[PDB]
Design a binder for this molecule. Structure first.
Ligand code: ZN
Lengths: 255, 56, 120, 259
RNA sequence: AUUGUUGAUUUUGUGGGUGGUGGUGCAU
C-alpha cells in the first residue's frame, strides 16, 4: 500500500511539473508572438481586402419595430386552488400562533431568553411631511373628514418603487401619522363626533398598513412619546395627561 | 465620464466651415469617422486597438 | 399631409430597415462617412455649438445633405423610436433626441417624394 | 492567400489556442475582429481545434467588437458548430462548461444570437437534447422582452417539431410582457392544432411538452386574450386536451378576464 | 444607461417566481 501510495504521489508530482513545464513554454511563445506582433500586423494591413439581407433577416427586423409599436401585456402567475390557499393560510396561522406562545413564555428575538435580559439590571405635487407640523400645513385648509384622503394620497405619491429613498420618507411619515392621530384626539370634537369617528378610525387603519412595513420607524416614535409623556408627568402630573394619551395606549395595543 | 466629447473633436468657424481636430484611423474596417485618442506618446484607436505614433 | 406628418412616417420607415443614426455622435459619424441622406435637427438645443456643427457638416460642399428644422427634441426622439408605449398606447419615458440622420430610406413612399420635392 | 510571414505567425497562434487554458491570449489573436478578412485569419487559427477555454474568450472578444451582421457569422459558423459537435461527440451528450458560457456571452447581442444560433439550429434538424441544453441557457440569462417576443413569434410560425416546442415553452416560462400581437400569434399557433378544413396539425399526436407550453400560456397570459380567443383555446382543449394537464388548462383559461 | 471605442445589449431603487445540461428505479 505504502509503495503504491509513493508511486501515486510520484506520478501526481510527475504530471504537475509537466503541466508547469507546459505552462512555462506557453508563456515563452506568447511573449515571442507579442514581440513579433508589429511585424505581423503590418503585412496584414498591406494585404487587407478592398471593400442583401436574407428574407428571414428582413422579417425579423420588421417584427422588432412592429412589436415596439404594439402595447405590452402584463404577466400573471398561476392561481392556487382554494384548498392550497386554505392550507397555506392555515400553515401561516399555525406558525404565527406558535411564535406568539414562545414569545409569551420568554422567547426574545434579538432567539434569546428573558433571563438573559436580567443580567446586571439590578446591579446598575403632493409633499411628504417629515414633521407633524408640516402635515398640518398641507391639511390646514381641508375639512376633518378629508384627512384620510390626503394621508392616503401621500402614501400613493411616495411608494417605494416610484423613486429612491421613498422607504425612508414613508418610514418617517409613519411616525408623523401617529402624532396626527394622537393630535386630533386632543382637539375638541364634540361638535362633529360622527365626522371625527370617520377620520380617527380611518387614519388608524392607514397607520396599521404602514406599521406592517415600517414598524421600526413607528417603534422609535412610540418610545419617544412614552419618554416625552413621562417628562410631562414629572411636572404637571395629571394636567399633562390628556385624551390623546389614553388613545395612544389604545393604538399600541392594535399595532 | 466625459460630456459632449464629440463636440470637442470638431471646431466650427464663423463661416460654418468644419475642421477636424483629431486624426482618423486608417484601418478600413474602422474606416472614416473612427478617431484616434490623442495620448502623449501615441495615438490609440478605441475600435481596432491599433497604436500609431503622434508624428507619423 | 403636413411636412411634420410626412416626416413621422418617413422616420418610422427608416427605423424598420435600421436606417437611422440617432444621437449627436452617430449623426456626426454618418455625415462624415457620406452615409447621410437627410438631417433632422432641433431648434431648441441649448448649446448653439451643436447647431453650428451639424449645420456646417450638413452644408459641406462635397456632400450637401438636406436639413430640416424641428421645434422640440422630445418629439424628434419619439419619431426616432426612443420612447416606449403604455397600456394606454401613448408614448411614455420618451428620450429627447437633438439630431437624427437618415442613412437608408428602406421603402419608397409618396411622403418621401414630397419631402424631396420640398427641398428641390 | 495571406502573406506567408503571417500564416506562420497565426499558425503558431493556433497551436497555442489548441491547449490554452488560462493567462493572456496572444496579442495577434486579440486583434482578429478588427481585420476585414477575419474569416480567413480565423480559418488558419483552426477553430475546431480551439480549446473550450479559447472558445469562451473568443466569444467575449468577437461579440463585443464585431458589428451585428459580422457577429452573426461568428456565432453561426463557429459557436453553433462547436456547440453541436461537442454534444454529439461527448459520451453523455452533455455540453462542456466553457462552451456553455460562450452561448451566454453570445446572447449579450440578442439579434445575432437568435438569427445565428437559435433559428439556424431549430431549422437544421435540432434534436431534443440540443434544445434542452440551449433552452437552459435561454432560461437563465436575461433577454430583452422585445427581442424575445420577436423570436417567439418566429418559432410559433415554424412547422411543429418537439425541439421547436421546447424553445416555445422556454420563452413563455420567462414571463415576458409579451406584446398583444405576439399573444395573438400564440393563440393562432395553438388554434391551428384543433380539428375542423385543416392540415395534419389537427390530427398530429401531441407530446407533453406541447401541453406544458400550452399550460404556461394559459397560466401567464389568460388576462391578455379576447373572449373569442378564449373560446377557441377552450375549443382546442376539448378536442386535443391531455388527460391530466387538460383540466388544469381549462381551469386557468376560465379564470381569466377578457382584455 | 452602459460595453470594450460602443449604442440602450446594460446600471440604479423597489417587489418577485423559480430546486434542474439532478440523479435513481418503474412501466412499449
Ligand atoms: Zn485600426
Amino acid at each position: 500500500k505504502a509503495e503504491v501510495m509513493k508511486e501515486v504521489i510520484a506520478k501526481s508530482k510527475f504530471y504537475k511539473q509537466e503541466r508547469q513545464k507546459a505552462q512555462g513554454i506557453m508563456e515563452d511563445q506568447i511573449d515571442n508572438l507579442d514581440d513579433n506582433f508589429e511585424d505581423v500586423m503590418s503585412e496584414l494591413m498591406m494585404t487587407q481586402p478592398k471593400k442583401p439581407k436574407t428574407d428571414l433577416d428582413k422579417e425579423y427586423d420588421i417584427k422588432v419595430k412592429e412589436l415596439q409599436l404594439d402595447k405590452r401585456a402584463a404577466p400573471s402567475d398561476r392561481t392556487k386552488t382554494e384548498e392550497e390557499k386554505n392550507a397555506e393560510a392555515e400553515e401561516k396561522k399555525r406558525e404565527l400562533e406558535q411564535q406568539r406562545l414562545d414569545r409569551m413564555n420568554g422567547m426574545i428575538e434579538l432567539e434569546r431568553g428573558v433571563e438573559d435580559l436580567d443580567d446586571g439590571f439590578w446591579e446598575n405635487s403632493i409633499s411628504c411631511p417629515r414633521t407633524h407640523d408640516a402635515l398640518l400645513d398641507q391639511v390646514k385648509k381641508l375639512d376633518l373628514d378629508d384627512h384620510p384622503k390626503i394621508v392616503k394620497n401621500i402614501i400613493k405619491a411616495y411608494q417605494p418603487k416610484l423613486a429612491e429613498g421613498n422607504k425612508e420618507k414613508l418610514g418617517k411619515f409613519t411616525a408623523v401619522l401617529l402624532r396626527h392621530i394622537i393630535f386630533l384626539s386632543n382637539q375638541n370634537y364634540l361638535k362633529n363626533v360622527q365626522s371625527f369617528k370617520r377620520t380617527q378610525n380611518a387614519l388608524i387603519s392607514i397607520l396599521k398598513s404602514l406599521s406592517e412595513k415600517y414598524n421600526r420607524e413607528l417603534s422609535e416614535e412610540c418610545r419617544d412619546y412614552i419618554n416625552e409623556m413621562q417628562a410631562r408627568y414629572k411636572k404637571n402630573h395629571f394636567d399633562a395627561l390628556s385624551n390623546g394619551d389614553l388613545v395612544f395606549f389604545s393604538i399600541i395595543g392594535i399595532l | 465620464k466625459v460630456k459632449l466629447a464629440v463636440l470637442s473633436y470638431y471646431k466650427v468657424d464663423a463661416e460654418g466651415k468644419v475642421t477636424k481636430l483629431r486624426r482618423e484611423c486608417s484601418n478600413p474596417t474602422c474606416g472614416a469617422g473612427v478617431f484616434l485618442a490623442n495620448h502623449k506618446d501615441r495615438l490609440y484607436c478605441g475600435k481596432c486597438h491599433s497604436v500609431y505614433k503622434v508624428n507619423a | 399631409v403636413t411636412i411634420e406628418d410626412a416626416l413621422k412616417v418617413v422616420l418610422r420607415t427608416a427605423l424598420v430597415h435600421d436606417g437611422l443614426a440617432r444621437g449627436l455622435r452617430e449623426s456626426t459619424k454618418a455625415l462624415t462617412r457620406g452615409e447621410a441622406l437627410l438631417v433632422v435637427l432641433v431648434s431648441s438645443v441649448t448649446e448653439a455649438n451643436i447647431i453650428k456643427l451639424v449645420e456646417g457638416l450638413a452644408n459641406d460642399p462635397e456632400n450637401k445633405v438636406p436639413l430640416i428644422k424641428v421645434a422640440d427634441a422630445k418629439q424628434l426622439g419619439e419619431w426616432a423610436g426612443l420612447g416606449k408605449i403604455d397600456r394606454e398606447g401613448n408614448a411614455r419615458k420618451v428620450v429627447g433626441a437633438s439630431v437624427v440622420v437618415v442613412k437608408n430610406w428602406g421603402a419608397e413612399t409618396d411622403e418621401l417624394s414630397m419631402i424631396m420635392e420640398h427641398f428641390s | 492567400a495571406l502573406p506567408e510571414k503571417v500564416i506562420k505567425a497565426y499558425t503558431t497562434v493556433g497551436s497555442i489556442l489548441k491547449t490554452w487554458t488560462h493567462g493572456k491570449l496572444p496579442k495577434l489573436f486579440k486583434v482578429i475582429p478588427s481585420l476585414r478578412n477575419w474569416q480567413d485569419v480565423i480559418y488558419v487559427t483552426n477553430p475546431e481545434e480551439w480549446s473550450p477555454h479559447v472558445v469562451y474568450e473568443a466569444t467575449k472578444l468577437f461579440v463585443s467588437n464585431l458589428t451585428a451582421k459580422e457577429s452573426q457569422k461568428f456565432i453561426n459558423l463557429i459557436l453553433l458548430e462547436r456547440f453541436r459537435d461537442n454534444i454529439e461527440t461527448s459520451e453523455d451528450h452533455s455540453l462542456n462548461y466553457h462552451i456553455y458560457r460562450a452561448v451566454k456571452k453570445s446572447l449579450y447581442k440578442p439579434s445575432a444570437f437568435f438569427k445565428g444560433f437559435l433559428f439556424p439550429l431549430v431549422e437544421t434538424g435540432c434534436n431534443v437534447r440540443e434544445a434542452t441544453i440551449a433552452g437552459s441557457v435561454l432560461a437563465k440569462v436575461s433577454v430583452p422582452a422585445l427581442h424575445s417576443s420577436a423570436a417567439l413569434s418566429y418559432l410559433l410560425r415554424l412547422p411543429f417539431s418537439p425541439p421547436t416546442t421546447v424553445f416555445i415553452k422556454i420563452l413563455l416560462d420567462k414571463k415576458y410582457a409579451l406584446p398583444y400581437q405576439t399573444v395573438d400569434d400564440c393563440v393562432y399557433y395553438f388554434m391551428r392544432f384543433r380539428i375542423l378544413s385543416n392540415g395534419e396539425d389537427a390530427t398530429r399526436v401531441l407530446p407533453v411538452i406541447w401541453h406544458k407550453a400550452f399550460l404556461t400560456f394559459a397560466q401567464r397570459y389568460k388576462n391578455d386574450i379576447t373572449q373569442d380567443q378564449r373560446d377557441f383555446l377552450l375549443e382546442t382543449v376539448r378536442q386535443r386536451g391531455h388527460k391530466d394537464i387538460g383540466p388544469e388548462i381549462r381551469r386557468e383559461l376560465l379564470a381569466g378576464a377578457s382584455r
